[PDB]
Design a protein around this ligand. Structure first.
Ligand SMILES: [Mg+2]
Lengths: 554, 85, 1324, 31
């Protein structure tokens, strides 16, 4: 193929074929003149090396081309050099009808549908518009229909939405480590330049909103549209393939609004009254005369599905909170009221969806998962939970443990100056003192953070669960665990060195009181070693899943 | 047999004296060999030296990739001239 | 006090005063180039360490069988032709002439001073020096490129262990490979079988017996030197063993020793305990009785030869048997050599490798060492000696530095300070005896990961070795040509050759890994890029060879590099940023200054400590309380002596830190409240702050650090005043200032022309401009700021714009990290940046016809040529859309061979058959803007159009109108001084006549400097720039696109909280407080308990108090208050809780209102890195600004209208805008072009790019029950010829037939297999 | 060290020709 400026481009495989013909013709000419046997062996040895360099190269021949130093890739070297001794089908293949863009969370979308920009839908469904304009009668030929989609007329958007109504498109992230990485969704024409994704489905993709890109795919054959709706739909893969736990679980933002809704309080506004049904609880709450969580008593008409094909009706007068009665409206008529009487934590709600899908079905579970997310985001905005400097309650007895441990370590150093204790004994007798002192700090913090509430109701003093913003984001399991709260309230502990040994000097200060200069340099050892193993974890785990699928492929 | 395109004998001898004249003029002027500079020294028109010096294309390989990392060769960067879409 | 300080004053919260200011940040790049270029002209004999030292090693030459020599006095550096602003406009590289002087010395090689001729003449311009600017960068072909510092290992010997799982051994000696400053390295690795096998960098393993024989020593003496520490003699009772108490310690004694004049030592069958070692040392005996049956397991050391029989009765490495002792007893052997080696000793390993390949003589090692040097070549006694002796004596490229000799001798122990450069026979036996000592357990391995084993290079040292290679080759051709030809007929101009010098220095600056592109997307990114120490490069370790030994921080990096400033991704830990106070030493090691402290008083002088000089003294921390007396008042202080952080006493301290900000880098010190954030978010906060984009309006950060002024001042982007004086006239294009009478010369006192740069294109397609911030008639001192650059506000670094930020989950829009913006951030045009994208067109020359820029285009209309001119260039300022014609470029062609179907349409509509194809330049889809300027380029001997005449006319009118206006300023400045001679008051006499003629001559002389420059500038416009062969004319345009913020962009702060904006909610939906101020950004409070970044809440609380104080002054200023009411309230802010502030210095009514009008939108605070404000100093600010104490106020809902039943944390938080917009990542395609061999979609059509469907997505589709889906994305959608065309017709018809087809990835594999002689067929 | 010492001895040798009588040839500027 020529290039710019009249310069050609010859492949290296053609050079090997031309070298053989230059020597094969000389063999026929030399053998037609009664040449001596000494000169015939010189030509036959050159023909052997020419054919040897044509099949493979780099082993013993290593032919060097002109104006360069790299060896020429032969035919057998082309198969080895094809994506590293692999085939073109087993490697990455460029496909059509695709596109990548930045993802964006959308709380106004259903579980089976997603978002799609208007400019992307015109390029992906381009062959589908030409078929609809000719069948309708607006476009006569296919050439006139091309100028209608590029002119952005007012009649091309009405015909475009006709093929987007029922057309499951595929979505996938860059790293695919499980089957839930490729799910089919129903695209909805939205305005913008981003893919509007569902908040609940983000747990399966394991992707956060920080600049991630997800590619799209449009199936053309109707045979592929049926197997993408019945198998690849987001409503079908509601259970993880690993275990029986569902993969569509309310995330940290949804579980925060549901935990505050189902809570117990000692004294509240509107406590002690009764209601006729669930319709009276919603009216009394939105009127501003009843609190969100108050000890009341209501009578509900619950239905139990213990008998197959029969739905009995029973009336029970239970005494629960105000918010717990509002959450039962979302729960269908196949589950009792005891499943919503708890605090509705993260692990306590993952077993409710697994139980709802097992005793009701799939059609009523997808609608229940969407209404649970709608009532989780609406009640999370009403309660303006915020983290501040007063939420990090530092225990007043924390300074007593540090000052006591500072006097015990000085006694060990005063003994080591004489020599009655060896170096190996004093090292283990001081590294366990700080480990034992870390438990007393965490025990004194959890006892103060949980009881950080003082209320009164016709009495002097009454204790209950604390309503702190930090405790709600840790007990509910939304984000973080109990091991991360110890770094903010209490001391961090003994930051071990990446060499294999633990550093004796601990970090007494926390994140609120501020770290020192030498105390912050020690924290850079464990933080830099954690990032070095994270980038290497994608190569070792990716290599483990690459050998198991090759033996378990048949 | 050196070049990939066989050139006739009556035209390849004209390029032998052009390369030797450009070799002496390279170190004599202490600069890059210009296409119009050799035309004035050898008493030749500018249109004749442009085609003769431009005949040597010096074609390079295609499978050899450029850069420090060999992620893709030149085979995956070329396109056709006819209608392929 | 500076003039810019009086305008805006930041309140500092530093509790301790700084005894040393921040030095120049770019001092590592400027000081490294002044030694290589040597632009300073002195009157004395300067040393000029650098290129001048390497140039002195060229003239002295030695020629075999001849006499030739040269003498070089020095070099001369010329002035550059193109300026700093013209070299970036046109295509040229900023260079400078380098003329040297070489004197040829011809001799007769007769060892006499007779018939010697010398000619002195200046040589040709040997290459061109880059001559970089004062900003630390050099322009190469119109682009700014910088060179990062290289980090390589120090020259010396290093011993390691390399404890890996592949060796399957707990103790295994690693390779004791030495690394010289230049040349090859010797890889000497100890074999796991107690053997030594040396190797080369590109050769196989060689035995130790072959390497020891090449040095000149015998194999028997070398094997007996490290072994045979005991001798045996036949005296007394036919045997006498040397009694050593160390050998018998812990070993059983099966031989009775009855010697000792009746004093027995041990008995037969008794174990030697701690009691038997006391009876042997108290007597001091050395001989004992040993039976002949005990020597059956011992072996000999060397070949025992007797002088009686003349033959070797016992060869080396043989056991002493019974029959062998009978021959040695009758031969009268004097001394028996037995290598006393046991399990308790170290054990000699030279005997196990001495029998390798039968290398018992020096002749066998010569023929074996030549096989690895030359492959397949014939072995010769002369060629093998030259190759073996090239690394020992004939060191051609085995030179070592002066510090490498003392470093290698310090590990093995040597009294000599400096020795020979190359390795000698005595200097090579120490590394062999030091490896066996570390193998037994005596001593420890070397420290390679510490700072004492690594050396930081520079730009001057990297360019010196690249210039010496290009110069050592040019002298080889001049030496051989001078002896072949005559000396009288030859000239030094024709003998020298500047081609290998200019070629080796130009291709090095463009094909090197260290000479990467300089990013100008942020002024902070410009400083942190030059202040980088890279490890990989020309000679360093790659990302795989490094492993994990260098990806970990070490305590030796305290105050030298940054542990929290490292880019995460494919290469983490390899490259690292330099510290703030880090200063390079003379040898190149990183040295950080400390404060020496004594037990009497703290000293004021500052000393610089090296890396290896820190293990002797103890260094304390700057966070120590003082009793205002100069002593350590604290009872304990955290110090470090053996590179370990621990506690020590304040009585033996010797060193102390200067400032706590000497550990972090420049990109990490600007983060407020860094002590409250985790190191994981501090590593990510320095990367997002570096990728900021300058917005349209520069908003100062209310919560700063104080180092923001030191980043924008030392940079070469702001207009810094060189001299002081009064500003004459302020204009948007340029600014002029006067020169004071104190710091002025005799003639031409007031001369200061500062040309402000306009909107030009940077290296990241971002806009850059300078706006004047001074007024006419202002007193400007030396070192002030006259104009601010991109993302700078009044000399302060202002990357992003701050706004009201609330922390609450708002309807799930802030799900994980998303941002919920408001409509007030888009209507006010806050995050709307300006991008400058350029487009260049070329004019190729083909044999079918030359390409020219014409006006007529085939198959176009009037609307396409409406915005075009009569020459083919788009007008300046014409609004172009996606798909318009910018430059008219036509390409002639022949032999079209049109089809009869197309010929029928050419006659109906009356379209003429144009034989020239239209290949004009067009803008891509989605890129629309306004052309700011058009730059054209022409060649010599080519005709120009009417468009190029208007460009040279505007350049000639601008260079003439400005030079005529600047001459009027100097003309008026000379008459005002001459008019000051009115002491006589005529309205002595000889003095005023000379001054009048001198003032008239100065005006006439100044005109000659402009006339010669105007004619020189006119020549630059009439000449054609040098371009690549094959381009007739290059016309490039510049578009200006304003990319406003839209849902999809990436926004983040300074604490490492990335976020993609979701939607733009209206003003009525944003939560508002009781006053009615709707918030703009609604973050997510769930990131605080998960990610340990508390600085987000501390900055939000200070941001609310900073705006509360600024709003109080705005209300007080508009209330028509007096002067005593404003200065009293300002004094209650700067001096309320702490900080160093000075008052009672501003003016009464001028400077007070000038400072109140600048703080009416918020009082900026300065919170240091580790010396920041405590919780009391922050809570006390909320009480003064009439704000809640806890900082959490309940807000009203915007949509429902009710009140939230929980306090919400509000305030102002600084936010940034990253260059990850959706306009450069969103793309889609259905059909396009394909390749030739493999029918796969690719780019080139300027439409979009297809994504790769890797194997990871193949296993996912197979996990489901998908069969036709995966078969479609492999055969129909790609790799097909007939399947794709037939499928496209099925979509238009309406029925999906789904033809089978055949993949093209398998049809190519069949043709490649059948061509290899192996058959393949389809049986079906 | 060794290279600078070689020209230093030649510089002292060339200076000896100035005393015994000798003038180094001077050439005008090049092209
Ligand atoms: Mg992500």
């Amino acid at each position: 193929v020529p290039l710019d400026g009249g310069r050609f481009a010859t492949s290296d495989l053609n050079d090997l074929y031309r070298r053989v013909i230059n020597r094969n013709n000389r063999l026929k000419r030399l053998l037609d003149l009664a040449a001596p046997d000494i000169i015939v062996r010189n030509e036959k040895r050159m023909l052997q090396e020419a054919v040897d360099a044509l099949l493979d190269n780099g082993r013993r021949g290593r032919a060097i081309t002109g104006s360069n130093k790299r060896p020429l890739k032969s035919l057998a070297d082309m198969i080895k050099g094809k994506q590293g001794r692999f085939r073109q089908n087993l490697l990455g293949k460029r496909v059509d009808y695709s596109g990548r863009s930045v993802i964006t969370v959308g709380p106004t979308l259903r579980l089976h549908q997603c978002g799609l920009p208007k400019k992307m839908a015109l390029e992906l469904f381009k062959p589908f518009i030409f078929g609809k304009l000719e069948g309708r009668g607006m476009a006569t030929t296919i050439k006139a229909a091309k100028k209608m989609v590029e002119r952005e007329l007012p009649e091309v958007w009405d015909v475009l939405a006709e093929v987007i109504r029922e057309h499951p498109v595929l979505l996938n992230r860059a790293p695919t480590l499980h089957r839930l990485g490729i799910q089919a969704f129903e695209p909805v024409l939205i305005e913008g330049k981003a893919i509007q994704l569902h908040p609940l489905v983000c747990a399966a993709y394991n992707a956060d909103f920080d600049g991630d890109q997800m590619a799209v795919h449009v199936p053309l054959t109707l045979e592929a549209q049926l197997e993408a709706r019945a198998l690849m739909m987001s409503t079908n893969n509601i259970l993880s393939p690993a275990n029986g736990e569902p993969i569509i679980v309310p995330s940290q933002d949804v579980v925060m609004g549901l935990y505050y809704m189902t809570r117990e309080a000692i004294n509240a506004k509107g406590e002690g009254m009764a209601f006729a049904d669930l319709q009276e609880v919603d009216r009394a709450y939105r009127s501003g005369q009843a609190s969100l969580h108050a000890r009341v008593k209501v009578r509900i008409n619950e239905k139990i599905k213990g008998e197959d094909g029969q739905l009995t009706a029973n009336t029970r007068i239970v005494d629960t909170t105000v918010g717990r009665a509002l959450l039962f409206q979302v729960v269908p008529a196949g589950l009792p009221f005891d499943v919503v009487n708890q605090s509705m934590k993260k692990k306590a709600i993952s077993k409710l969806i697994n139980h709802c899908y097992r005793v009701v079905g799939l059609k009523d579970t997808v609608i229940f998962a969407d209404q649970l997310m709608y009532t989780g985001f609406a009640y999370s905005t009403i309660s303006g939970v915020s983290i501040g400097v007063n939420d990090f309650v530092i225990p007043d007895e924390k300074a007593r443990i540090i000052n006591a441990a500072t006097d015990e370590v000085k006694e060990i150093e005063s003994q080591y100056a004489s020599g009655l204790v060896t170096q190996g004994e004093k090292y283990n007798k001081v590294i366990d003192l700080w480990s034992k002192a870390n438990d007393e700090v965490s025990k004194a913090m959890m006892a103060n953070l949980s009881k950080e509430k003082v209320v009164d109701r016709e009495g002097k003093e009454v204790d209950q669960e604390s309503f702190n913003s930090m405790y709600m984001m840790a007990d509910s399991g939304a984000r973080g665990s109990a091991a991360q709260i110890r770094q903010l309230a209490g001391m961090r502990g003994l930051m071990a060195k990446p060499d294999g040994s633990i550093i004796e000097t601990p970090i007494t200060a926390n994140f609120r009181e501020g770290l020192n200069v030498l105390q912050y340099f020690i924290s850079t050892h464990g933080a830099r070693k954690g990032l070095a193993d994270t980038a290497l974890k994608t190569a070792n785990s990716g290599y483990l899943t690459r050998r198991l699928v090759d033996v378990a492929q048949d | 047999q050196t070049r990939t395109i066989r050139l006739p004998i009556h035209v390849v001898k004209e390029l032998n004296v052009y390369l030797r004249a450009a070799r002496e003029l390279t170190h004599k002027l202490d600069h890059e060999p210009s296409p119009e500079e050799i035309a004035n020294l050898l008493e030749k028109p500018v249109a004749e030296v442009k085609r003769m010096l431009g005949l040597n294309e010096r074609v390079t390989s295609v499978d050899v990739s450029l850069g420090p990392d060999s992620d893709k060769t030149l085979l995956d960067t070329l396109t056709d001239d006819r209608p392929t879409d | 006090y500076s003039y810019t300080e009086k305008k805006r004053i930041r309140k500092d919260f530093s509790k301790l005063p700084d005894v040393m200011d921040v030095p120049y940040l770019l001092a590592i790049q400027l000081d490294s180039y002044r030694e290589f270029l040597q632009a300073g002209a002195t009157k004395e004999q300067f040393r000029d360490v650098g290129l001048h030292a390497a140039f002195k090693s060229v003239f002295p030459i030695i020629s075999y069988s001849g006499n030739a020599a040269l003498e070089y006095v020095g070099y001369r550096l010329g002035e550059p032709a193109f300026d700093v602003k013209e070299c970036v406009l046109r295509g040229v590289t900023f260079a400078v002439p380098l003329r040297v002087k070489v004197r040829l010395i011809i001799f007769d090689r007769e060892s006499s001073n007779k018939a010697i001729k010398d000619i002195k003449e200046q040589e040709v311009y040997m290459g061109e020096i880059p001559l970089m600017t004062e900003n630390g960068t050099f322009i190469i072909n119109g682009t700014e490129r910088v060179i990062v510092s290289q980090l390589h290992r120090s020259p010396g010997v290093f011993f390691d262990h390399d404890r890996g799982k592949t060796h399957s051994s707990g103790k295994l000696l690693y390779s004791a490979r030495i690394i010289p400053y230049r040349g090859s390295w010797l890889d000497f690795e100890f074999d796991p079988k107690d053997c030594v096998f040396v190797r080369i960098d590109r050769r196989r393993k060689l035995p130790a017996s072959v390497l020891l024989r090449a040095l000149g020593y015998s194999t028997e003496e070398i094997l007996n030197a490290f072994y045979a520490t005991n001798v045996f003699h036949i005296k007394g009772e036919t045997l006498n063993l040397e009694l050593v108490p160390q050998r018998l310690r812990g070993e059983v004694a099966s031989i009775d020793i009855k010697d000792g004049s009746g004093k027995v030592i041990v008995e037969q069958g008794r174990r030697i305990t701690a009691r038997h070692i006391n009876q042997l040392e108290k007597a001091g005996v050395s001989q004992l009785e040993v039976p002949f049956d005990y020597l059956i397991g011992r072996t000999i050391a060397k070949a025992i030869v007797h002088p009686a029989t003349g033959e070797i009765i016992a060869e080396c490495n043989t056991e002493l048997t019974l029959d062998l002792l009978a021959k040695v007893a009758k031969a009268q052997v004097v001394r028996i050599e037995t290598l006393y080696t046991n399990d308790i000793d170290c054990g000699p390993f030279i005997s196990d490798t001495l029998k390798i390949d039968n290398t018992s003589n020096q002749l066998e090692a010569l023929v074996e060492i030549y096989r690895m040097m030359r492959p397949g070549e014939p072995p010769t006694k002369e060629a093998a000696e030259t190759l073996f002796g090239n690394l020992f004596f004939s060191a051609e490229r085995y030179d070592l530095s002066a510090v490498g000799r003392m470093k290698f001798n310090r590990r093995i122990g040597r009294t000599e300070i400096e020795g020979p450069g190359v390795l000698s026979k005595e200097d090579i036996i120490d590394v062999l005896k030091t490896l066996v000592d570390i193998r037994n357990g005596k001593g420890i391995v070397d420290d390679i990961d510490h700072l004492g084993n690594r050396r930081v290079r520079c730009v001057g040292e990297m360019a010196e070795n690249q210039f010496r290679v290009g110069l050592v080759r040019v002298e080889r051709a001049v030496k051989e040509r001078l002896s072949m030809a005559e000396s009288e007929g030859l000239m030094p101009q024709d003998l020298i050759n500047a081609k290998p010098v200019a070629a080796a220095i130009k291709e090095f600056f463009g094909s090197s890994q260290l000479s990467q592109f300089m990013d100008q997307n942020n002024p902070l990114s410009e400083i942190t890029h030059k202040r980088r120490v890279s490890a990989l490069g020309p000679g360093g370790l790659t990302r795989e060879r490094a492993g994990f030994e260098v990806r970990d921080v070490h305590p030796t990096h305290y105050g030298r590099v940054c542990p929290i400033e490292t880019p995460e991704g494919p290469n983490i830990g390899l490259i690292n940023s330099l510290a703030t106070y880090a200063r390079t030493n003379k040898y190149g090691f990183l040295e950080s200054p400390y404060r020496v402290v004594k037990d009497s008083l703290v000293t004021d002088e500052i000393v610089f400590l090296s890396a290896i000089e820190e293990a002797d003294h103890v260094i304390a921390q700057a966070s120590a309380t003082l009793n205002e007396k100069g002593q350590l008042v604290d009872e304990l202080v955290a110090v470090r002596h053996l590179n370990e952080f621990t506690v020590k006493a304040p009585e033996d301290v010797t060193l102390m830190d200067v400032s706590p900000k000497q550990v972090v880098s420049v990109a990490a010190s600007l983060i407020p409240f860094l002590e409250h954030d985790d190191a994981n978010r501090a590593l990510m906060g320095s990367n997002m702050q570096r990728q900021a984009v300058p917005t349209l309006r520069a908003d100062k950060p209310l919560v700063g650090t104080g180092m923001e002024r030191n980043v924008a001042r030392d940079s070469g982007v702001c207009v810094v005043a060189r001299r002081g004086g009064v500003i004459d006239s302020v204009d948007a294009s340029r600014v002029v200032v006067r020169v004071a009478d104190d710091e002025v010369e005799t003639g031409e006192a007031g001369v200061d022309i500062y040309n402000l740069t306009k909107y030009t294109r940077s290296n990241q397609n971002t806009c850059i401009n300078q706006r004047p911030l001074v007024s006419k008639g202002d007193v400007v001192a030396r070192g002030d700021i006259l104009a601010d650059g991109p993302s700078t506000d009044m000399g302060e670094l202002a990357l992003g714009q701050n706004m009201r930020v609330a922390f609450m989950p708002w309807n799930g829009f802030n799900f994980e990290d998303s941002i919920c913006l408001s409509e007030r951030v888009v209507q006010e045009d806050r995050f709307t940046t300006i991008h400058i994208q350029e487009l260049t067109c070329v004019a190729r020359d083909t044999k079918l016809g030359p390409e020219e820029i014409t006006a007529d285009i085939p198959n176009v209309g009037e609307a396409a040529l409406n915005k075009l001119d009569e020459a083919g260039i788009v007008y300046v300022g014409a609004e172009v859309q996606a798909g318009d014609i910018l430059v008219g470029k036509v390409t002639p062609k022949g032999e079209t061979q049109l089809t009869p179907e197309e010929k029928l349409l050419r006659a109906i509509f009356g379209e003429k058959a144009s034989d020239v194809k239209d290949t004009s330049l067009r803008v891509p889809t989605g890129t629309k803007g306004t052309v700011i300027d058009v730059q054209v380029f022409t060649r010599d001997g080519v005709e120009r159009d009417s468009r190029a005449l208007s460009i040279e006319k505007m350049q000639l009118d601008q260079i003439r109108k400005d030079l005529n206006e600047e001459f009027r300023i100097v003309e008026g400045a000379t008459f005002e001084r001459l008019r000051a001679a009115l002491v006589g008051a005529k309205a002595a006499d000889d003095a005023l006549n000379e001054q009048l003629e001198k003032a008239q001559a100065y005006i006439s002389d100044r005109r000659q400097l402009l006339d010669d420059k105007f004619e020189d500038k006119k020549r630059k416009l009439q000449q054609g720039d040098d371009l690549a062969p094959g381009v007739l004319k290059i016309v490039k345009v510049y578009l200006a696109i304003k990319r406003r913020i839209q849902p999809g962009d990436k926004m983040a702060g300074r604490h490492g909280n990335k976020g993609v904006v979701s939607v733009i909610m209206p003003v009525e939906d944003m939560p508002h407080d009781a006053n009615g101020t709707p918030v703009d950004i609604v973050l997510n409070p769930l990131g605080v308990p998960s990610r340990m970044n508390v600085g987000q809440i501390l900055e939000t609380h200070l941001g609310l108090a900073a705006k509360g104080l600024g709003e109080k002054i705005n209300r007080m200023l508009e209330e028509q208050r007096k002067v005593a009411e404003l200065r009293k309230f300002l004094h209650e802010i700067y001096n309320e809780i702490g900080g160093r502030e000075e008052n009672l210095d501003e003016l009464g009514d001028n400077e007070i209102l000038a400072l109140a009008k600048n703080l009416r939108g918020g009082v900026p605070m300065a919170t240091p890195v580790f010396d920041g404000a405590k919780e009391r100093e922050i809570k006390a600010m909320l009480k003064l600004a009439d704000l809640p104490e806890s900082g959490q106020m309940r807000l009203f809902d915007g949509r429902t209208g009710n009140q939230f039943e929980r306090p919400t944390t509000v305030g102002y938080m600084y936010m940034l805008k990253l260059n990850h917009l959706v306009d450069d990542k969103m793309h889609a395609r259905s059909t396009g072009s394909y390749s030739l061999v493999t029918q796969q979609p690719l780019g080139g059509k300027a439409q979009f790019g297809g994504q790769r469907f890797g194997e990871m997505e193949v296993w996912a589709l197979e996990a489901y029950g998908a069969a036709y889906t995966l078969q479609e994305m492999l055969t129909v959608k790609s790799d097909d010829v007939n399947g794709r065309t037939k499928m496209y017709k099925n979509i238009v018809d309406g029925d999906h037939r789904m033809e089978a087809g055949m993949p093209e990835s398998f049809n190519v594999l069949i043709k490649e297999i059948r061509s290899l002689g192996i058959d393949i067929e389809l049986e079906t | 060290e060794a290279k600078q010492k070689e020209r230093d001895a030649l510089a002292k040798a060339m200076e000896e020709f100035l005393s015994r009588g000798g003038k180094v040839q001077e050439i005008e500027p090049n092209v």
